[PDB]
C-alpha cells in the first residue's frame, strides 16, 4: 500500500543500492533467490509480490557504463532483481556533466522512464522516490539531473528524496567534482523535495573513531548509508507508537521550500567490542546525534542555527524517555536553535530494532536517526564554491563541456544561484529584531 | 432516555477511544466478543446509551472511527476490544494528513467528511431521544484537529439542540511531539470556540506529571495516559448510565458550568489516584477524594489554577456516600479558598453523586474545572504562533492546500479574543 | 480533639524525630508495620493527637520530614519504625545544604519551603482543632538552622494562634562537630525569638553528662541521646495524650521575649543501681531539680529559677513513676553568651562569610542578628538581679 | 586473613531519588516505596541487640 | 476466517512479547544481546 520507488544512479548509487538491498532483504526475510522461507504486508514498500511467492525489488539501477551492473548480475543477488530493471548504456560518462546530461542521457532516458512508469503502475499508493547518487561522476550528476527534470513534469505531485554523496571538503577523488557539483546542485535544487547529503570524509571519521576500523572502505560507508535510509523508511515498513510518514519527513524538516537540505546522523554506530562499556540509553543515543563528530558531513553545527529536527527511534524505546532526552537537549547552550521555531522537534517511534548484517555495526535494541535542518551546511556549500571559483577563474576543463554540447553560461548561472542559496540561508538563520 | 454518539478522530483520539471503550466495557460487562456476562442487573438498565443492540443479545459501540491513514485502524482492530466495533463504522482514507490542519480541513479530509457524516447520521438517527456527541481528538497535529473541527462544524449545523463534548489533547509547554503543533492548535481553537458546548483540554505533560508523582508508575506509557482520560470520561458520563442521588447529566453540567457561552474550556480531573506502595497509608473517604480533587497537581491540563480564579466547579462522585458530608466538604473548600473563586458567582460548585462506583474501588470523584487559569494555555500557544508566524515559516503547505494569510491572523486574533473575556472575569 | 503536627528539619532533627516516633509508637501500642497491637483501651482513647487514621486501622504519624540532602530521609525509612510514615511526607532536596544558613534560608531552602508548606497545610487541613506544631531541629549546621527557621517563619505567618514547640539542639561548650555552628546558631536564635512560642534548648554535652555520670553507660550512642530527648518530648506532650501546651506556655512564659527552656526527665537510674532504687515523689523531685540531669549545658545554680514545671506520670511503659521538668531560668544567659563571643571572634576578622555573602546575603545581616541577640540578653540579666 | 566482606554498612538503592526504574530487576510496574532495603535483614539483627537506656 | 485468526494471534503474541520487554525497566533503559555481541566479536576476530 505504502510503496516507494528507488532509483540508483551511478557507481555510488549502484553500490549503495547493493548495501541497501542486502539490508532490506535481511530485514524482511527475502532470500537472494527472491523467496521468503517463512511464508505479512511489510514487503510492499520495497518489494512486489509476483506469483509463486517471488519478491521483486521496486528499484531501477541506472549506469551509463557496464560492469558495475554486471557485478550485480553475476553475484549473489542476480535472481533477485528483474533484468529489465538494471539498465546500462555503452559509454562511460567520464566525469562529465555534459556527457551525463546532454548527449549520453538520451539513449537511456526513454527506457528508464518506461521502467519507472511500469513500477508506478504496479503501485496503489506511491509514497515517493528515493534517488541515490553522488555529486561526483558524470552519470551521477548529469543523468540524475535529467531524470529529475523528466520526473518533475511526469510525476509532479509525488515526493522525492535525494540521497547524494557530497564531495569531501579536503580529500575527494577527482579534479572535475567541483564543476559537476555546482552544475548539479542548481538543477536538483528545484527538483528535489528533500535532499540528504553525506560526505565521505565524515563517514571516514565516524568509521575510524566509533567503529575502530583503521582502514574503512566503500562497503562500510554504503552499509552505514543503508542503515540510515532504512531507519528513515521504517515507520512505513513496520508498526510503532508514533508512526511518521514520508510526507511527515518532508513536513517537519522544511520551514521554506528552498531549505530542504537536512543532515542525517545515526546512533549506535558502536563496534561490538565497545558496547560492553556504555549503556546506549535513549539519552546517550540522542546526545551522540547532536555531538558535532557523528555528523555525516564535515560541518560544525555549533557554527550554525538548528532550524528543525526529526528523531526516528527504532526498538524498545518509550516516549517518556524520548521526552526526557529532548528536555535534556533543550537546556544546553551549545545546541542553539532559532528563535522562530521554539518547538523544534518531531518524534517518530517504531517497534522494529535494526537488523544486523554480518559486518561492522553492533546488535542494539535502540537506535535513532536524526534528520536535522540547520544553517551549518553553508560551509560545505561554500568550500566547493571556492574550489569552483579558483578553477573557473581561468576556465580549466571547460572545453570538454562546451565541445560535448552544453553552453558556457551554465557555470556562472549555477554559481550565482548557489550564492543566492547561501544568502537565503543566512537570511533565514539570522534572528528577529523588529 | 438519552444517548451520546462517540466519535474518535486521529491517532490520539482513536487510541484514547480504543481505551474509553475497554474501560466502559469492563464497567458494564461486555466481553471482547460483544455479548454480556456480568454480575448485577442494573448494568443493562441504561446500556442503550453507548451501545447499540445486535443479534444474539450482544452489544456494539455507537462509535465512529475517523482517520486519514489506515495504520491505527489495524491497531484498534488488533487491540483487546477490537472485535466489537462496527466494521462499517471503520471509515478511513488511503492518504496522509502529514500533521497539517490544511490537509484535514480543506483537502482529503473534506473529501472523506461526507462518508463520515453518512455513518454519523446513521448512528444519530438510530435513536429516539439523542443527547449529544462526544469527540476525542488532539489539537496538536492533523486529522484530529482539522477533520475533527470540520466534523464538529457540520454536526453542529445539522443538530443544533444536541450537545457537543470534545475531549481534546492540547499541546504542552514542556515537550512537543510535532513542530507545527502551534499552527494546528491555533487553527483548531477558533473552530472549537463557537461550535462546541463542553471542551476538555488535556495536557500530556500534566498526564505524565500525575503518572510520575501521583501514580508513581515506573513506566508511564500511552495506554496508561489514555486510561486516565478514559476514567475521567466514564466519571463524567455516569449519572445518565447508573442510578444515583442528585443525578446530573451532561446538559445540567453544561448549564451549570458554562456561565457565558464562549467560556467553556474545562480542566478535567480524577482523584481516587493512589500508588500501590502507598495504598495502605491512605484513608480514601469524602475529604480525601475532594482533597486530592482540588489539589492543584492532579489537573490534567497544565494550566495552574492558583494563578487564576475558578469560575465554576463540578464534582461527579461515584459510589454511595454521605450527602451531608459532601455538601459540608464543598462548603468547606469554598470557605477555605476564597481568593481562587470569583465573587460574582456564589456557591459555584455543583455536586452529583452516583451510587455505583467504578471497578476496583468503592468511592471515586471526577473533577470539571472552568477557571481563569485556562488563559495560560492560550497565551502560550499565541506566543508560539506569533513567534513562528512572525517569519511565516512552515506555511507553504497551508498556502498550497488553499488557506490564506488572513485566516492565520483571524485565528490568532480569535485566540486573543478569548484571552480577553477570561481575564475580564478574573479581574471582575 | 487536639492534635500536633510534627515537622523535623535536618539530619539531627530527622534522627531525633525517628526515635521520637519509635518511643511514641511504643507508648501507644503501634507496631513498626502500623497496626495497633496493645493491651489497654485507654491508648486508643486519644490516639488522634499524633496519628492520623488510614484504611484498615492503620495509624500513620502526622509528621513532615524535611532534609535538603537526599540521603538522610532514606536512612529514616531504613530505620526500625521507618515503615510507618507517609511516603509523600518525605519531601527532600536533590542538593546539599552544606552547613550553611544561607543555603537553607535564601536559596534551595527557599525554593523547597513552598513544597514543605504545601505538605504542612496538607496535614493541617485534615484535622479539627490544631493546638500547635512541633519542630525538631539542630540549631547548628544547615537545614535545621536555615530551612528550619524559614519554616518557623512561614508557619507563624500562616497559622497565628498555634503553639510552636521547637526542640533545638544548641551548640555545646566542650565539643563542636562543625566550625560554622556559631554563625548558624547566632543567625537562627534571632528567628527563634520572634516566631516560636516554646524553644527547648537541648545540648549534647549535657546529654552525655546525664548518660555518663548518672546512667553509667560505657559506650553511649546517638540513639541513646535521641532517646533521652524523645522521652523528654513525650513527657512534655503526654497531658493531652493521656496542664496542656497553652497552660504551660501561659504559666511559664512571663514576658513574651524570654521563653528558652531547660528540659529534663528524671525517673533515671543506671542498671547497676536500679535494684536499690526506692522510687517515690521526693526521690523524683531530688532527681529532677539537681543540676546533673539538665539537658542544656548551662548550670541553673548560676542563675535564678524564673518558672518551673513538673509533669508527673499513665506512666511510660516499663516504668513506675516518671517526672518531666521544663524550666525557664536566668541560666540560659550562659548559652547565648558563650556563643556570642564565638560569633564576634569569627566575625571580627571577617572570615567564613564569603560563602554566606555569595548566596544573596549582605554584611549588615550578621551585625543586626548579633545586635538583637545581645538585646535578648538584657531581659535575661535584669530579671536575674531584679 | 585478608578481608571479610561486611555488607552491614553501605548505602543501598535509593527508594526516593533516581526513580527511572532502571535499578531493580524484573518487571515492576510500581515504584518501590515499601521500606525494605536489601540491607534490612543484615541490620535489623543489630537493632534487636540495641538496648534502650531506661530500666534495662 | 482462519487467516484472520492467524493474523490476530500474531499481533497478540507480538503485543505480549513487547509488554514483557518494555515493562522491564532495567533491560529497557540499558541492555543488549550479550550473546549476539560475543558472536559478533568472534566473527570480527575470524575475519
Amino acid at each position: 500500500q505504502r510503496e516507494c520507488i528507488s532509483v540508483h544512479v551511478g557507481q555510488a548509487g549502484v553500490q549503495i543500492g547493493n548495501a541497501c538491498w542486502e539490508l532490506y532483504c535481511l530485514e524482511h526475510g527475502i532470500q537472494p533467490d527472491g523467496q521468503m522461507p517463512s511464508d505479512d504486508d511489510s514487503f510492499n514498500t520495497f518489494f512486489s509480490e509476483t506469483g509463486a511467492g517471488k519478491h521483486v525489488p521496486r528499484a531501477v539501477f541506472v549506469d551509463l557504463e557496464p560492469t558495475v551492473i554486471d557485478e550485480v548480475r553475476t553475484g549473489t543477488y542476480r535472481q533477485l532483481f528483474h533484468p529489465e530493471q538494471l539498465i546500462t548504456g555503452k559509454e562511460d560518462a567520464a566525469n562529465n556533466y555534459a556527457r551525463g546530461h546532454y548527449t549520453i542521457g538520451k539513449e537511456l532516458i526513454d527506457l528508464v522512464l518506461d521502467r519507472i512508469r511500469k513500477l508506478a503502475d504496479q503501485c496503489t499508493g506511491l509514497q515517493g522516490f528515493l534517488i541515490f547518487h553522488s555529486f561526483g561522476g558524470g552519470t551521477g550528476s548529469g543523468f540524475t539531473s535529467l531524470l529529475m527534470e523528466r520526473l518533475s513534469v511526469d510525476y509532479g505531485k509525488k515526493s522525492k528524496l535525494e540521497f547524494s554523496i557530497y564531495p569531501a571538503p579536503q580529500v575527494s577523488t577527482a579534479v572535475v567534482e567541483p564543476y559537476n557539483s555546482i552544475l548539479t546542485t542548481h538543477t536538483t535544487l528545484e527538483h528535489s523535495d528533500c535532499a540528504f547529503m553525506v560526505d565521505n570524509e565524515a563517514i571516514y571519521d565516524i568509521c575510524r573513531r566509533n567503529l575502530d576500523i583503521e582502514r574503512p572502505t566503500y562497503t562500510n560507508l554504503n552499509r552505514l548509508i543503508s542503515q540510515i535510509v532504512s531507519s528513515i523508511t521504517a515507520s512505513l515498513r513496520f508498526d510503532g507508537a508514533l508512526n511518521v510518514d514520508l510526507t511527515e519527513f518532508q513536513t517537519n524538516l522544511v520551514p521554506y521550500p528552498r531549505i530542504h537540505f537536512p543532515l542525517a546522523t545515526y546512533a549506535p554506530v558502536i563496534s561490538a567490542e565497545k558496547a560492553y562499556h556504555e549503556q546506549l540509553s535513549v539519552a546517550e543515543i540522542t546526545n551522540a546525534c547532536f555531538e558535532p563528530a557523528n555528523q555525516m558531513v564535515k560541518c560544525d553545527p555549533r557554527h550554525g542555527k538548528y532550524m528543525a529536527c526529526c528523531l526516528l527511534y527504532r526498538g524498545d524505546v518509550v516516549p517518556k524517555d524520548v521526552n526526557a532526552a529532548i528536555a535534556a537537549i533543550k537546556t544546553k547552550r551549545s545546541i542553539q536553535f532559532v528563535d522562530w521555531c521554539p518547538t523544534g522537534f518531531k518524534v517518530g517511534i517504531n517497534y522494529q530494532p535494526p537488523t544486523v548484517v554480518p559486518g561492522d555495526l553492533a546488535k542494539v535494541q535502540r537506535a535513532v536517526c536524526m534528520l536535522s535542518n540547520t544553517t551549518a551546511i553553508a560551509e560545505a556549500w561554500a568550500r566547493l564554491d571556492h574550489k569552483f571559483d579558483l578553477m573557473y577563474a581561468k576556465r580549466a576543463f571547460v572545453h570538454w563541456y562546451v565541445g560535448e554540447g552544453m553552453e558556457e553560461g551554465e557555470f556562472s548561472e549555477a554559481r550565482e544561484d548557489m550564492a543566492a542559496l547561501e544568502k537565503d540561508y543566512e537570511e533565514v538563520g539570522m534572528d528577529s529584531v523588529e | 432516555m438519552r444517548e451520546i454518539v462517540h466519535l474518535q478522530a486521529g491517532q490520539c483520539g482513536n487510541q484514547i477511544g480504543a481505551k474509553f471503550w475497554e474501560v466502559i466495557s469492563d464497567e458494564h460487562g461486555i466481553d471482547p466478543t460483544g455479548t454480556y456476562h456480568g454480575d448485577s442487573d442494573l448494568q443493562l438498565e441504561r446500556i442503550n446509551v453507548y451501545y447499540n443492540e445486535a443479534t444474539g443479545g450482544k452489544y456494539v459501540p455507537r462509535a465512529v472511527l475517523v482517520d486519514l491513514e489506515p495504520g491505527t485502524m489495524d491497531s484498534v482492530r488488533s487491540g483487546p476490544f477490537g472485535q466489537i466495533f462496527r466494521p462499517d463504522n471503520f471509515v478511513f482514507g488511503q492518504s496522509g494528513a502529514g500533521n497539517n490542519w490544511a490537509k484535514g480541513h480543506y483537502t482529503e479530509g473534506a473529501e472523506l467528511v461526507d462518508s463520515v457524516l453518512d455513518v454519523v447520521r446513521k448512528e444519530a438517527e438510530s435513536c429516539d431521544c439523542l443527547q449529544g456527541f462526544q469527540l476525542t481528538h488532539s489539537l496538536g497535529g492533523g486529522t484530529g484537529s482539522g477533520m475533527g473541527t470540520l466534523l464538529i462544524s457540520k454536526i453542529r449545523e445539522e443538530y443544533p439542540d444536541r450537545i457537543m463534548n470534545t475531549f481534546s489533547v492540547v499541546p504542552s509547554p514542556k515537550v512537543s511531539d510535532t513542530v507545527v503543533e502551534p499552527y494546528n492548535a491555533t487553527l483548531s481553537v477558533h473552530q472549537l470556540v463557537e461550535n462546541t458546548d463542553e471542551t476538555y483540554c488535556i495536557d500530556n505533560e500534566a498526564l505524565y506529571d500525575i503518572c510520575f508523582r501521583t501514580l508513581k508508575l515506573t513506566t508511564p506509557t500511552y495506554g496508561d495516559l489514555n486510561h486516565l482520560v478514559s476514567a475521567t470520561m466514564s466519571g463524567v458520563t455516569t449519572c445518565l448510565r447508573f442510578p444515583g442521588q442528585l443525578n446530573a447529566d451532561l446538559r445540567k453540567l453544561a448549564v451549570n458550568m458554562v456561565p457565558f457561552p464562549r467560556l467553556h474550556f474545562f480542566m478535567p480531573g480524577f482523584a481516587p489516584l493512589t500508588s500501590r506502595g502507598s495504598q495502605q497509608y491512605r484513608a480514601l473517604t469524602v475529604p480525601e477524594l475532594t482533597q486530592q480533587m482540588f489539589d492543584a497537581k492532579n489537573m490534567m491540563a497544565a494550566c495552574d489554577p492558583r494563578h487564576g480564579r475558578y469560575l465554576t466547579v463540578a464534582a461527579v462522585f461515584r459510589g454511595r456516600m454521605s450527602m451531608k458530608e459532601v455538601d459540608e466538604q464543598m462548603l468547606n473548600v469554598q470557605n477555605k479558598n476564597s481568593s481562587y473563586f470569583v465573587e460574582w458567582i456564589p456557591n459555584n460548585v455543583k455536586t452529583a453523586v452516583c451510587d455505583i462506583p467504578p471497578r476496583g474501588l468503592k468511592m471515586s470523584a471526577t473533577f470539571i474545572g472552568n477557571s481563569t487559569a485556562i488563559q495560560e494555555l492560550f497565551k502560550r500557544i499565541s506566543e508560539q504562533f506569533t513567534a513562528m508566524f512572525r517569519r511565516k515559516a512552515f506555511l507553504h503547505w497551508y498556502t498550497g492546500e488553499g488557506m490564506d494569510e488572513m485566516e492565520f491572523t483571524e485565528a490568532e486574533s480569535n485566540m486573543n479574543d478569548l484571552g480577553n473575556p477570561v481575564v475580564t472575569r478574573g479581574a471582575c | 480533639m487536639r492534635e500536633i503536627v510534627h515537622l523535623q528539619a535536618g539530619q539531627c532533627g530527622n534522627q531525633i524525630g525517628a526515635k521520637f516516633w519509635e518511643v511514641i509508637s511504643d507508648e501507644h501500642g503501634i507496631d513498626p508495620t502500623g497496626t495497633y497491637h496493645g493491651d489497654s483501651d485507654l491508648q486508643l482513647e486519644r490516639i488522634n493527637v499524633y496519628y492520623n487514621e488510614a484504611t484498615g486501622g492503620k495509624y500513620v504519624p502526622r509528621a513532615v520530614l524535611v532534609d535538603l540532602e537526599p540521603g538522610t530521609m532514606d536512612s529514616v525509612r531504613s530505620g526500625p519504625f521507618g515503615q510507618i510514615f507517609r511516603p509523600d511526607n518525605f519531601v527532600f532536596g536533590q542538593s546539599g545544604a552544606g552547613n550553611n544558613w544561607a543555603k537553607g534560608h535564601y536559596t534551595e531552602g527557599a525554593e523547597l519551603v513552598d513544597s514543605v508548606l504545601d505538605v504542612v497545610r496538607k496535614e493541617a487541613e485534615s484535622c479539627d482543632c490544631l493546638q500547635g506544631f512541633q519542630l525538631t531541629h539542630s540549631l547548628g549546621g544547615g537545614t535545621g538552622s536555615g530551612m528550619g527557621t524559614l519554616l518557623i517563619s512561614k508557619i507563624r505567618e500562616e497559622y497565628p494562634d498555634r503553639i510552636m514547640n521547637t526542640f533545638s539542639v544548641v551548640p555545646s561548650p566542650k565539643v563542636s562537630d562543625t566550625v560554622v555552628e556559631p554563625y548558624n546558631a547566632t543567625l537562627s536564635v534571632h528567628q527563634l525569638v520572634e516566631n516560636t512560642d516554646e524553644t527547648y534548648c537541648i545540648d549534647n554535652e549535657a546529654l552525655y553528662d546525664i548518660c555518663f555520670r548518672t546512667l553509667k553507660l560505657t559506650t553511649p550512642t546517638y540513639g541513646d541521646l535521641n532517646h533521652l530527648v524523645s522521652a523528654t518530648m513525650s513527657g512534655v506532650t503526654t497531658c493531652l495524650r493521656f496542664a496542656d501546651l497553652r497552660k504551660l506556655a501561659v504559666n511559664m512564659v512571663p514576658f513574651p521575649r524570654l521563653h528558652f527552656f531547660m528540659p529534663g526527665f528524671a525517673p533515671l537510674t543506671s542498671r547497676g543501681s536500679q535494684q536499690y532504687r526506692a522510687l517515690t515523689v521526693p526521690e523524683l523531685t531530688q532527681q529532677m531539680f539537681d543540676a546533673k540531669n539538665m539537658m542544656a549545658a548551662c548550670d541553673p545554680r548560676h542563675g535564678r529559677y524564673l518558672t518551673v514545671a513538673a509533669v508527673f506520670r499513665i506512666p511510660p511503659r516499663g516504668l513506675k513513676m516518671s517526672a518531666t521538668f521544663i524550666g525557664n531560668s536566668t541560666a540560659i544567659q550562659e548559652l547565648f553568651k558563650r556563643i556570642s563571643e564565638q560569633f564576634t571572634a569569627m566575625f571580627r576578622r571577617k572570615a567564613f562569610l564569603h560563602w554566606y555573602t555569595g548566596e544573596g546575603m549582605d554584611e549588615m545581616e550578621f551585625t543586626e542578628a548579633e545586635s538583637n541577640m545581645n538585646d535578648l540578653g538584657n531581659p535575661v540579666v535584669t530579671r536575674g538581679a531584679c | 586473613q585478608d578481608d571479610d566482606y561486611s555488607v552491614v554498612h553501605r548505602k543501598c538503592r535509593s527508594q526516593f531519588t533516581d526513580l527511572n526504574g532502571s535499578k531493580r530487576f524484573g518487571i515492576n510496574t510500581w515504584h518501590d516505596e515499601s521500606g525494605i532495603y536489601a540491607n534490612s535483614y543484615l541490620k535489623r539483627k543489630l537493632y534487636s541487640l540495641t538496648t534502650s537506656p531506661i530500666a534495662p | 476466517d482462519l487467516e484472520e485468526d492467524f493474523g490476530q494471534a500474531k499481533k497478540r503474541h507480538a503485543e505480549l512479547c513487547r509488554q514483557k520487554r518494555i515493562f522491564n525497566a532495567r533491560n529497557r533503559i540499558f541492555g543488549g544481546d550479550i550473546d549476539a555481541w560475543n558472536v559478533q566479536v568472534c566473527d570480527q576476530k575470524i575475519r
Binding site: - | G79, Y222, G319, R359, G360, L361 | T55 | - | -
Partner: peptide
C-alpha cells in the same frame, strides 16, 4: 456502615495501569 464507607482499593484497580505497549 463504616466497613463500606471506607474505601480499600482492590487488584481490579491496579490491574488496569500498564496494559499496553503503545
Amino acid at each position: 456502615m463504616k466497613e463500606i464507607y471506607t474505601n480499600q482499593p482492590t487488584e481490579d484497580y491496579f490491574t488496569q495501569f500498564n496494559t499496553r505497549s503503545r
